Amino acid sequence: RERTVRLQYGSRVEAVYVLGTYLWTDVYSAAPAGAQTFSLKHSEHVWVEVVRDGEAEEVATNGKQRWLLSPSTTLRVTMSQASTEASSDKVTVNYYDEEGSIPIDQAGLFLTAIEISLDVDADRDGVVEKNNPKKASWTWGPEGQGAILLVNCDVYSKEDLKDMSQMILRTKGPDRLPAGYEIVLYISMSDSDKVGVFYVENPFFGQRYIHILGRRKLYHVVKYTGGSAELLFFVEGLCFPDEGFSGLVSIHVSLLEYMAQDIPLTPIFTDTVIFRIAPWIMTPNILPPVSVFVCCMKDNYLFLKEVKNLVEKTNCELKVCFQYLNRGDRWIADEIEFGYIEAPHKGFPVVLDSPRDGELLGPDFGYVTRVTSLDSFGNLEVSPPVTVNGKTYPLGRILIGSSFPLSGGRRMTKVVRDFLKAQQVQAPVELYSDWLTVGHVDEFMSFVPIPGTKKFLLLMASTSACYKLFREKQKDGHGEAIMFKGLGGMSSKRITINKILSNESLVQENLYFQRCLDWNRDILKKELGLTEQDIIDLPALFKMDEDHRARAFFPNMVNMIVLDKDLGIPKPFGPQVEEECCLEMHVRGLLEPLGLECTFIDDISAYHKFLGEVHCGTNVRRKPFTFKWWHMVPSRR
Amino acid sequence: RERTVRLQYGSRVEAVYVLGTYLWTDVYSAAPAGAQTFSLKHSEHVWVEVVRDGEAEEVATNGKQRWLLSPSTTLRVTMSQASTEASSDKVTVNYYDEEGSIPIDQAGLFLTAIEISLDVDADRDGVVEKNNPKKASWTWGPEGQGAILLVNCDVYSKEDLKDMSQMILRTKGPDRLPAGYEIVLYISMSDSDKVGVFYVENPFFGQRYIHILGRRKLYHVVKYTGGSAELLFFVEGLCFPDEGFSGLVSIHVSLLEYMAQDIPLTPIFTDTVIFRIAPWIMTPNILPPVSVFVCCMKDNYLFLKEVKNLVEKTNCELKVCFQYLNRGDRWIADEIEFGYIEAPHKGFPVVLDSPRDGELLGPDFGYVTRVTSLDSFGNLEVSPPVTVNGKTYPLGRILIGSSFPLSGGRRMTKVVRDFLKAQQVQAPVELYSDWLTVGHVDEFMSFVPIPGTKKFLLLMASTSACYKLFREKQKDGHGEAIMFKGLGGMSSKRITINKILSNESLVQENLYFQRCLDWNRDILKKELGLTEQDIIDLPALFKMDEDHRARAFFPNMVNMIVLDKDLGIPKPFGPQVEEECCLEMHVRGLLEPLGLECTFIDDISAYHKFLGEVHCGTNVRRKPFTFKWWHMVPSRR
Numbered sequence A, B: 001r002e003r004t005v006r007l008q009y010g011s012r013v014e015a016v017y018v019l020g021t022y023l024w025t026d027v028y029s030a031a032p033a034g035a036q037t038f039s040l041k042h043s044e045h046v047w048v049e050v051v052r053d054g055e056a057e058e059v060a061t062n063g064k065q066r067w068l069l070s071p072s073t074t075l076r077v078t079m080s081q082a083s084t085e086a087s088s089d090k091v092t093v094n095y096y097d098e099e100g101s102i103p104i105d106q107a108g109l110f111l112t113a114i115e116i117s118l119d120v121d122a123d124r125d126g127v128v129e130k131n132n133p134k135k136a137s138w139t140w141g142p143e144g145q146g147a148i149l150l151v152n153c154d155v156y157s158k159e160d161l162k163d164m165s166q167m168i169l170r171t172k173g174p175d176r177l178p179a180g181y182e183i184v185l186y187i188s189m190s191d192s193d194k195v196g197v198f199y200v201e202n203p204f205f206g207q208r209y210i211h212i213l214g215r216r217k218l219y220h221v222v223k224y225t226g227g228s229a230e231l232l233f234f235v236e237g238l239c240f241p242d243e244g245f246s247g248l249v250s251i252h253v254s255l256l257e258y259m260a261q262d263i264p265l266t267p268i269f270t271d272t273v274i275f276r277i278a279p280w281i282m283t284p285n286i287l288p289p290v291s292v293f294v295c296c297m298k299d300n301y302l303f304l305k306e307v308k309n310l311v312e313k314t315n316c317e318l319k320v321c322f323q324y325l326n327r328g329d330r331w332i333a334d335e336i337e338f339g340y341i342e343a344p345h346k347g348f349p350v351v352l353d354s355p356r357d358g359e360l361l362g363p364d365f366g367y368v369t370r371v372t373s374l375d376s377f378g379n380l381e382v383s384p385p386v387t388v389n390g391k392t393y394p395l396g397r398i399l400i401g402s403s404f405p406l407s408g409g410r411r412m413t414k415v416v417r418d419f420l421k422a423q424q425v426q427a428p429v430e431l432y433s434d435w436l437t438v439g440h441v442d443e444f445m446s447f448v449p450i451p452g453t454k455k456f457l458l459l460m461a462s463t464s465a466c467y468k469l470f471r472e473k474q475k476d477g478h479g480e481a482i483m484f485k486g487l488g489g490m491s492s493k494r495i496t497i498n499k500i501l502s503n504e505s506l507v508q509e510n511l512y513f514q515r516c517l518d519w520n521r522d523i524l525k526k527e528l529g530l531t532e533q534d535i536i537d538l539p540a541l542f543k544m545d546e547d548h549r550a551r552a553f554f555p556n557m558v559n560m561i562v563l564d565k566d567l568g569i570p571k572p573f574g575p576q577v578e579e580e581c582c583l584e585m586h587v588r589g590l591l592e593p594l595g596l597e598c599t600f601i602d603d604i605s606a607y608h609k610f611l612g613e614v615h616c617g618t619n620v621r622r623k624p625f626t627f628k629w630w631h632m633v634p635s636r637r
Ligand SMILES: [Ca+2]
Pocket: A120, A121, A122, A123, A124, A125, A126, A127, A128, A129
């Protein structure tokens, strides 16, 4: 960067020189009227070129050389090292008329050179490098650069700032700034609700970090200390990307020059760093499980026993919670979503919380707290990593249940949809859930890893599979086999394979629900790049309400606890053939040959009947993806 | 795209097949219980593969082949041509048990194939190509694709729709759609204030085009006609890109299937096109002039005569306007900005209008009608095309005067700043104009082409140049030379070179204003990639007000009429030496050697004095850039 500094007619000029810039200097304006030529001297650490019409020649410290005075003949002044108290850094120009060789006047330029750099970890290694040339930009991808900030999801203490990002103002110079200069750190009004910055204002009095930039504080004057010095700042994000916010914020430092009272200070030098605030990222079922969270009523003993036994087969820990006044019976699944955030060499899990009526588990998590049933997190899923038509989605894609565009049906609130879109790295896809009374994608689909491989399966509810199985068992002589054995509140209904197959309206309803399932099947194959070999159909059956929407006839087996090879599958209570549930046997026959281990989990016996509602919930916290989100290259919007 | 269509147990299935998709068909669900194998027949124009575990084999129209019934053995059904009335397109599956070789049941699939494509000119040649594979995306650059829409800047007539973009729904099929289907064109609620779509609903009754999509209309059912048919739609943009609007809009067509009363229709097939709305683009001084617009009082005869004479030296036309009650005296410069919009094979000039208190020239223009003095268009300029550190700005960069970030000074309204930023193709830069009372960048800088070359110069006001010239003329014995000769209302002041040079406070004021000019010089060199060889300094002088802001002491010569080589330059009324103005002679000596022709234009004599205010304005309409804006690749935000 070239900066204009003119010599002054009939006076000396004193200026600060910031390393990394250079000066172009007009010597002609300061020349007395009638002066013809000029010469110059300069000090050891100041480099001077005489530039005429673009042609530059280096000039010695004390030569006698003279040049014609012209508006097109100027100086270029460069310094490569900061001034110390030993410095006298200067350039002196002498002017001559035609008459003789003794100077008729002189104009000086006295310089104080300083280094000023606002530094961040732009190369994303966890260290703060010196003046990364790319620090004022933010680029995506493996070769991309620019610094990353985490949202704070939780007088100040340094330990409290441990999770924040470091920003270091590095300076070099003499004991003090020359008269009339100050250094100021600042942000825009717009960014003031996106960030906060902390600094120890008075280090002689202790280590106390105070908030110096943020809401209502757009600038802070910082003290200059001499020699080589560093000022350490900690930076936090205040919010995630959203509809009106890209995730990018900027922080500036300027060297300001005092002009006079009532006049603004002049920005002599400005340095800028950019941060991107890390997005919230959801974890698919294929990622390693860490902890399993379940909620249920305190007396559902079978559920607790069976979930405990399932988890004991794994390296996961179990966390048990009971029911609350302000939450639904499924709240750990419906009102809580486990996700994570990551910055170089720091990250943690972050839970989204949307309480029904408005506790937590552990200090290890960050928390983000915020209508129809489509707003529930049961209506959010995320796929495993996929490649679709050559486009990679290394973090998978978020799936959100919705209705058809022209339907006038239900949709997840725009605030949440827009939030998920703005995170960008999971590129959300809308599915069709509004054919279900509750309206959650987890009622009809799930993903499971295939043991021993890097691959996965999509599991889909299928009414066609159920009708085929029941028709087969009827042909085999099992028509009188009863559903819901052991549920006493169902017994009077005497539900058998025969009774189901002869119910004409229920057949028609389920053909329609299969069309709904198949519409989703097609979107999933398109948007996830799946073929029929990637899909397994689990038998399912629904009843229709007055709104023509579906509720489960028997428990939906697709919404299962996935711990690697081990699957907790809701107990279906299907027709018994040879004293085994034919639904359990059929599901084992589909899954077990792939190395999946099935355990059926009974959450409904404690209620004595099944009306389509599930009274328990589970959620699994998983390890984050190995792939760093900042290595993705999302499509430009 | 693969689409799920299942055969139905104990019933025939009839389906529409859309060309460009194919069907996967489950034959297992429709099989009677206990059935073992299946065979199939199909018609001539339906292609059928039997797919087992991913392995596909083509099957003849009538063979006897049998396959084992398995959930993992399915059909893939393809059609390459639309159905006609001569068509019977079908696949029939027969089922067998173990007992014998006569079919025990049969399931049919009856098909009607149609072509449906919503087509736009995505390859940007002005024609609407058939089904551009990239039509649902919009990409920048020479190799980029996707369709372009113009904002409308002005029952309907086809002639009135001439400037709009064409969109054509192309179909092929038999006489009618099968029972229970319709075709619907639609847009999102969000896009409904961004676009409008016109169509002839009833072509048997006339050519009347009606508005079918837009505000309050999100969908339109379109009539299907048989054979090969085209429906022509015209599309308009309603607004330019802005802070909350990228410029992209989408239009969809869906084939919908009727399910039953009270249930939404199913979207069987959907096709999407995207448009980008063309940005508003400003024209720099280097572009060829077309028309010169001037405004002044009716009796400023010298101004009119001299502007007429200047324009007569060129191929430009002159348009003269007088003063209005609702506008400032400079309104043609201050309240009007000439720009343009362009789409493939269509474009026109578009004027931004911001009246002071709230006419036009010509049908040839589009008009966009909308506070401090920084809101004036005198405070907007645009640079010639530049390359900065390897980054090209083929349309130049917009320049907007502002104050320093921490100053608490004036700034152009956010609405206008955000508008200019959102157009993206001119990548705006803020300068510092708030040191001027009026606060307009055109008070201190301008660009001019260098005759005979592809290059240009930045012209900067310079107080240092004025003081140097005046000190020289004083040394030469001209100190008593008077300013403002012929302006009778100035005479009593007896302003001479001596009086100016001896005014100590004015010297100090102008040293400060030179610092302001130099701060801008540095930003311009940085952001436009300019060196000192690209800049000429014109003598200027200012007086300071109570706010420490500048007004011209004598007319600012930098704000000039630029018609290629011919420059209309405000007459300065400088000190007379040998009966010529020394300011005019100095300016000629700078410009004329470069092949620029200078004419001094007197707009102030009719007022008898000069107080810092200019009472006339000029604006030049220019030819658009040859470079197409859609070939640029702007930085991603
Ligand atoms: Ca680093």
